[PDB]
Amino acid sequence: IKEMPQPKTFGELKNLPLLNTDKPVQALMKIADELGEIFKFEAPGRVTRYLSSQRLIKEACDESRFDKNLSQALKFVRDFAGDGLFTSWTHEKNWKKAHNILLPSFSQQAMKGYHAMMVDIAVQLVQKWERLNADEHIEVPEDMTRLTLDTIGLCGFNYRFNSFYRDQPHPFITSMVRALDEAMNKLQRANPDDPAYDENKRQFQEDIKVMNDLVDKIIADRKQSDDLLTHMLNGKDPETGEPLDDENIRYQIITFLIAGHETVSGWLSFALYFLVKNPHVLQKAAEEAARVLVDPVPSYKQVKQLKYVGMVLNEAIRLWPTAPAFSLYAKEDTVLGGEYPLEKGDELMVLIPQLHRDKTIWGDDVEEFRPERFENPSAIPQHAFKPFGNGQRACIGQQFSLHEATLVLGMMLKHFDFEDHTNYELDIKETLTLKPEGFVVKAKSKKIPL
Amino acid sequence: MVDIAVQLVQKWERLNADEHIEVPEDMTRLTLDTIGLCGFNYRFNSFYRDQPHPFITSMVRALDEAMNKLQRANPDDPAYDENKRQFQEDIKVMNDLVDKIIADRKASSDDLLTH
Amino acid sequence: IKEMPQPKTFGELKNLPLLNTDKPVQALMKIADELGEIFKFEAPGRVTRYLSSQRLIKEACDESRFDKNLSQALKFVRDFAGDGLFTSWTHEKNWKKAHNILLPSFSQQAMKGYHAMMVDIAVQLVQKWERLNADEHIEVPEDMTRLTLDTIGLCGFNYRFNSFYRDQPHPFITSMVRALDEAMNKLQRANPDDPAYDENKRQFQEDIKVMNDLVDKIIADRKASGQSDDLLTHMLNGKDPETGEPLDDENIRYQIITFLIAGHETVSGWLSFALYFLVKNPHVLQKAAEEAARVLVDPVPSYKQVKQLKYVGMVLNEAIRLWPTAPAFSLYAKEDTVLGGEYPLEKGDELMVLIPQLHRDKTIWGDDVEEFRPERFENPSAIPQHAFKPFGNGQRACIGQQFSLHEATLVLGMMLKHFDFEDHTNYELDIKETLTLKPEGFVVKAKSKKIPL
Amino acid sequence: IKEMPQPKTFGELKNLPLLNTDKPVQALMKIADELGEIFKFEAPGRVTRYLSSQRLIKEACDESRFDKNLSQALKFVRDFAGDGLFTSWTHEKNWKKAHNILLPSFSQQAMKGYHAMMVDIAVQLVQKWERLNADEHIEVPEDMTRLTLDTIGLCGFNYRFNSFYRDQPHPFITSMVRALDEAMNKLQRANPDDPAYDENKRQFQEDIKVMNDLVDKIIADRKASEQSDDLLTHMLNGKDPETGEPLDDENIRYQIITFLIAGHETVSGWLSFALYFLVKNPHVLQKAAEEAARVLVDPVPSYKQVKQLKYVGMVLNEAIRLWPTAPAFSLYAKEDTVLGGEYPLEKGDELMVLIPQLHRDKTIWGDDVEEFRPERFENPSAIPQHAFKPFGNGQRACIGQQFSLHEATLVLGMMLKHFDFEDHTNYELDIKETLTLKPEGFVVKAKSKKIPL
Ligand code: FDE
Ligand code: FDE
Ligand code: FDE
């Protein structure tokens, strides 16, 4: 039962200066590489422990001892998402209520309903790229969020953002980035009440009104369908017989627009990066897509058969998990790993990109992109691969993402050949999530019609 | 009372043609200004404000807290630390406003506060 | 005498660094104090000469030799005021057309029509100040912009901004301040295409959208739903004698913006400075409150009574002499000429009149040019021509001079009748500069004289 | 019985944002004008109460209940002034020790010895101005630091700084202003250990080494042969009457720094202000030059002649009244006490005397506190006790008080004898704040009266 490592302190500022970058998650990974499986991290008022090894995280994922915690990041995001599924505490009224009301919308059969609409937007993406003249290129992260925002909008709410009819980023997304960017910058503000932050605070509200105005436009377009929005309005709580409060329903819409398109958007962009940097892996998935997608538009069953594309997807999110961390707190007093005592209420952070690079589980080539590690999904021991959270607070849209990413990635491989014409150097922008910045490619159409 | 009521009428007469009226927000503007003037000779000037008076926001959040504590199973859950904080933040603002009313009289009547 | 004075130069940046302050006009007032009646001012790409003495200003006011120029300041205001009266060239189409169409709206026959609506806005201010609690104070420039904006909206467009029902400045006022502040800061950018200014370049546009969204709201309440005889009917219905046609809807919108801005912003500064000199010169305040008690004998002021507030008008004039809230106007050389017999000008050379400096000429105003003595205006005829130019010059002079002076006189009259004013902080005059001038933190406390309305 | 006023608060930062300007003392003077005779000012770890009225300052100057305190400003200057006379606690061994040995260096008999050296520096200033060409001007605070620094150098240590042979300031003054400004800016830092201030910490230390490299130059040039009878002789050889010992090598090092800084910086500010009031108040300037022409009848003035320039001293007294170049001094409560019968104080609580605010108490000086009226100082006996405190209080009052006034009169006497001064720029007073006060960018022109030396 020994003492815990800790990085450099700056007097009364503690460890806060060490995350004084636009890339805090990558700075924590360096500290993890420098200090190991666990280290203590102090801020003016907060203290947290970062876990990097599967040995300690395996006990942290035990729901008998640990419960989902709202990190200082989520408490700031709660300023515009409120008590929706992502930023809710487990033991507060609306998490249980809404979790059970929304869960039918993510069943395997609900996915069959989404498929036609997912195919709608994916065809729009293929048609955008097929109409590029020979000199033009593609901005990967921008066209992916065009697609992922449109999917969550059409399937969830029957609302058309028409992102492909906008050369500019969609206004909802542009202020959302600023709101998520603001939240992350507040984690680095020592004294958030300095007058210097008065422009920053007023812009922050300006961006929330933009997010709420769109939601009221989504609500006004309804009040003919059995989508996710019908379920928010109509589902009863079995114990009380009542539907979700209107203020919560606005909160869940925001949550799904954000969590339901950004992490999928980063995902697809990373998968395209690793393919275009590993050209043999790209032709093996291109062979599978040419084999399985035999129709002008894909069917639901065909997506289920793109086994190798799926492994590409799992190996990308292993290397770069687009939601990079989740937080826990100590239900009751306990000792961690038989060496580290924790009092009730002590907080842990699972550093997901560090868990997925644990040499002791994945072998001594953790940093290489090898999709063939997931040819045997069962081989990997429990709690070693945690890109979607843990337990009852794990990602509810866990199958929706996989189907959307697989379908979209499948059709791109069927219809285009991709050249990394600039020799792109991977640069990971951090909002609270991860995405490659300025990643561009060229796509020669294989001239297969739709 | 007529003082406050005339202020409300004049607010509605000066709206432009396309605008509308949110009734409970303008009613709280009227009734609160009335208790302030009649009770304490104190002018909240609620109709000279766009958003609610800060006393009104802290009061409703305090009343909302009181009602929500009734439905709460496990009152020490970490989910409620913000609530305990915010509750105490809302107590100080209501007392501060009462400190402003009491002190504003030590300057200066035969109203409720005089009794 | 032949060579022209010029301040310190900074390499390929010329004189531009000299204006790196939040207060550029007062910084120019100090260069003139050091260099005299005229000096050359170079920035990367532009050159202008600043005039300060009545001797040269009288020559520049010769309309046969000089015409109104769009200073670099106004060219940037033209990005949202467009082709309106203020930012229009004399010889381009929509100036003379709009001027002839709109001049009837500022005759003093129209002023009597506006008077009832101006009284409306003014009573709302009196009632705000009477309803403050004992400990409260007043923010002077903030409450003056509420009144001046509400007056131009109601009299000009039959529109109510309802600024006294709003805690914060009205949304138009907030974007407009940022648009003027963006303009003022653009005069200092060595490279306006630098990526550093992308948030500025985008923020600037967001604020243009807000002002035009209000202009759409005013026209939405008119050119559909209804019969007024205000400024806007004249914009929609007046015709041009040479062409027979009214103004294009695009220009009308530019004219609405210009009247919202130039018609309240300069006025709110006027009242704030006038009230500043009053609480700093209490005997001038006593004499003005005596005329106000005498003339304003009814519960509400009439048009005839305002025309009789003579000492108040001298205060207002002595205020605008010290701090002319639109602080400069620009001119250029129609043809080659020599100015003052020593400084030649090629055709097209630009001159800028430094109004606060011309108003501080000792050779004209005597030896107490900085004292606030309203009695210098006791016989308005005694002043030399081109000695007092707070409202511009020639045919491009301020079209709203009789409108502003009437508005400023009426409101200052009612405050003096209804309140006693305390400079409870010993306010030190700190004058914020957008493109207009107003004091920044001026506050007072006001004891009500308990006179009914 | 009364709660104490406090200005606007900013969350956990308390009042600290309010002084985030380049002019914190002038910002506190403003806060005093709104909040009155005493207000509490909170910072994250510290609390201080600012006094402005003679009513409360007379009690703070009571040495049985209050003793000199080190404000946060002096605690930072103690980082390079160390244990010297200014930054020591009165209960420290080195204070009474250094006071008793150095106090003789300022007895009247010494002034006669310094007088010859003082004249040397001043004659250099007169002839510097006599050698300016006609178009050139004079930088007032820049030449005054040249004089006072050279004077303390020659009178104190027999060391020639030769400032009039210098480009821009000496390396000591150049390094010292940065050290004093760093000290002033450390007062605004929410968290000092922040990495952003590493360039500042590096630069602050680099400037401390420069100043010591000069005291070491002075010490080495002295013990290299040594029968002087100056202040440095007393530091090295005099023994303390109470303890029989002389000063530490470490402490002699700290006093040399102490005397070079506070002993020229406040004198230079003083003289710049007096010259500002002279060129802005032309009636007092003629009376001062008519007396100086009267008394200074020799090629050089004698000690006896300077002691007779009564009106010149009155100007100096009225200058330092309005702008005490050392703007504040700090006190703490020996034991629990009640201040003003209204505000209770715990033992050790900190008070700040706001000297420019004390000198503007209309209840003591009359209703013309902003007027430069030297005749308040004609019969000093009328002046109520503790109303005029430009040199501190009690046993911790300014030790060089007579030294400074005599130097200031001598120089001010000679400038007036030899020159008429033109305020050719209409300089607008701008008060730069290091930890001391001086006018920034004050310039004049001086036509020589052509009187030989
Ligand atoms: C719609 C959708 C879509 C999606 C996607 C995704 C991707 C790609 C990735 C991801 C992730 C995730 N998630 Fe995700 N997602 C979603 C969602 C969600 C929600 C609602 C949540 C929360 C849940 C609960 O709690 O109930 C999540 C959730 C999630 C998580 C966890 C959180 C915490 O904090 O714990 C993670 C890690 N997600 N994700
Ligand atoms: C409504 C209104 C109001 C007003 C006011 C005023 C005041 C207080 C002051 C003033 C001023 C002036 N203006 Fe003034 N104002 C107005 C207006 C105007 C207009 C529209 C103009 C333009 C004209 C022409 O050109 O046509 C002006 C204008 C003006 C001027 C000139 C500018 C230039 O550049 O030239 C001046 C200086 N204004 N202002
Ligand atoms: C040499 C010299 C010169 C001078 C000058 C002067 C002038 C002009 C002004 C002045 C001032 C003064 N000071 Fe001055 N001075 C000097 C000095 C000094 C010293 C050493 C001191 C210390 C003392 C004790 O004891 O602490 C002083 C001191 C002094 C003071 C006090 C501080 C406190 O905190 O208490 C004051 C306020 N001074 N000052």
Burial of C240 (0-12, 13-18, 19+ CB in 10 A): middle
Could you give the CA distance from residue A133 to residue A146 in angstroms, rounded to a whole number?
Answer: 20
Instruction: Determine the Cα angle at C54 with ends C50 and C59, to 5°.
Output: 80
User: Which member of A13, A17, A193 has the closest CB to residue D12?
Assistant: A193
Q: Which run of H or of E encompasses D146?
A: helix D140-157
Q: Which of C326, C321, C330 shows the shortest CA–CA distance to C277?
A: C321
Q: Which run of H or of E encompasses D363?
A: helix D362-365
Phi and psi, residue A440, nearest 5°: -130, 150
**A270, A388, A416, A418: which is the annotated catalytic residue?**
A388
Contact state of A191 with D192 under an 8 Å Cβ cutoff:
no
Could you give the CA distance from residue D15 to residue C155 in angstroms, rounded to a whole number?
Answer: 45
Question: β-pairing, A325-330 with A347-351?
Answer: antiparallel
Contacts of A94 in chain B (CB under 8 A): none
Ligand 3 contacts CB of residue D266 (under 6 A) = yes
* C-alpha pair distances (Å), D193 with each of A12, A13, C32, D182: 7, 7, 46, 14
Residue nearest to atom 27 of ligand 3 (CA): D398
8 Å CB contact between D245 and D124: no
Contacts of A347 in chain B (CB under 8 A): none
Could you give the CA distance from residue D323 to residue A35 in angstroms, rounded to a whole number?
Answer: 58
* C-alpha pair distances (Å), D135 with each of C28, C33, D201: 22, 16, 43
Looking at residue B103, its amino acid is A
Q: Which run of H or of E encompasses D344?
A: strand D343-345
Task: List beta partners, residue D333.
Answer: D66
Q: Which of A327, A332, A350 shows the shortest CA–CA distance to A87?
A: A327
Looking at residue C347, its amino acid is K
Question: What sign does the CA torsion over A48, A51, A56, A60 have?
Answer: positive
Structure tokens at B8: 């409300």
* C-alpha pair distances (Å), C335 with each of C4, C58, C181, C338, C340: 20, 17, 34, 10, 15
Task: List beta partners, residue C37.
Answer: none
Q: Give A105 Cα–ligand 1 centroid separation in angstroms.
A: 14
Structural domains of chain D in order of their starting residue, each with its CATH number: 1-453 (1.10.630.10)
Burial of D185 (0-12, 13-18, 19+ CB in 10 A): middle
Contact state of A191 with D191 under an 8 Å Cβ cutoff:
yes
Closest ligand to residue C405's CA: 2
Q: Which run of H or of E encompasses D443?
A: strand D443-448
DSSP state for residue D161 in the 8-state scheme: -
Looking at residue D238, its amino acid is G
8 Å CB contact between D176 and D201: no
Burial of D246 (0-12, 13-18, 19+ CB in 10 A): middle
Number of CB atoms found within 10 A of residue C167's CB: 10
8 Å CB contact between C331 and C350: yes
Could you give the CA distance from residue C72 to residue D365 in angstroms, rounded to a whole number?
Answer: 50
Could you give the CA distance from residue A397 to residue A358 in angstroms, rounded to a whole number?
Answer: 26
Q: Which subunits sit against A, judged by 3+ Cβ pairs under 8 A?
A: B, D
The position carrying tokens 């989508």 is A227
Q: Give C148 Cα–ligand 2 centroid separation in angstroms.
A: 15
Q: Which of D451, D389, D429, D354 shows the shortest CA–CA distance to D141?
A: D429
Q: Which long-range contacts (CB under 8 A, 24 or more apart) does D133-140 make?
A: D137/D424, D137/D443, D137/D444, D137/D445, D138/D443, D138/D444, D138/D445, D138/D446, D139/D441, D139/D442, D139/D443, D140/D272, D140/D275, D140/D276, D140/D439, D140/D442, D140/D443, D140/D444
Q: Give D296 Cα–ligand 3 centroid separation in angstroms.
A: 29
Q: Annotated active-site positions of D, please?
A: 266, 391, 398
The position carrying tokens 């504003």 is B104
Ligand 1 contacts CB of residue A393 (under 6 A) = yes
User: Which member of B74, B78, B79 has the closest CB to residue A345?
Assistant: B78
For helices C140-157 and C171-186, the axis angle rounded to 10 degrees is 110
- What three-state secondary structure class fits A237? coil
Per residue, the 3-state secondary structure of B34-81, as one string, reads HHHHHHHCCCCCHHHCCCCCHHHHHHHHHHHHHHHHCCCCCCCCHHHH
Closest ligand to residue A74's CA: 1
Q: Which of C409, C428, C407 shows the shortest CA–CA distance to C417?
A: C409
Resolution in A: 2.3
8 Å CB contact between D445 and D419: no
Residue C205 CB contacts under 8 Å (≥ 6 apart), including other chains: none
8 Å CB contact between C49 and C351: yes
Contacts of C131 in chain B (CB under 8 A): 43, 45, 48
Q: Give A190 Cα–ligand 1 centroid separation in angstroms.
A: 29
Could you give the CA distance from residue D323 to residue D439 in angstroms, rounded to a whole number?
Answer: 10
Q: Which of A336, A349, A396 shows the shortest CA–CA distance to A71?
A: A349
Is the backbone of residue D353 left (phi > 0), alpha (psi -120 to 50) or beta?
beta
User: Which member of C128, C134, C168 has the closest CB to residue B104?
Assistant: C134
User: How many whole angstroms from its chain centre is CA C408?
Assistant: 12
8 Å CB contact between C236 and C248: no
User: Burial letters for A380-419: b for 16+ Cβ neighbours within 10 Å, e otherwise?
Assistant: beebbbbbbbbeebebbbeebbbbbbbbbbbbbbbbbebe
Beta strands in A37-149 (DSSP E): 38-43, 46-51, 66-69, 138-139
Phi and psi, residue C245, nearest 5°: -110, 150
* C-alpha pair distances (Å), A338 with each of A63, A335, A342, A358, D5: 18, 6, 11, 20, 56
Q: Which run of H or of E encompasses C50?
A: strand C46-51
Could you give the CA distance from residue C419 to residue A61 in angstroms, rounded to a whole number?
Answer: 71
Residue nearest to atom 15 of ligand 2 (CA): C400
Experimental technique used? X-ray
Residue D340 CB contacts under 8 Å (≥ 6 apart), including other chains: D38, D55, D56, D59
Could you give the CA distance from residue A327 to residue A345 in angstroms, rounded to a whole number?
Answer: 12
Residue A332 CB contacts under 8 Å (≥ 6 apart), including other chains: A65, A344
Closest-CA residue of C relative to D34 is C425
Closest-CA residue of D relative to C441 is D30
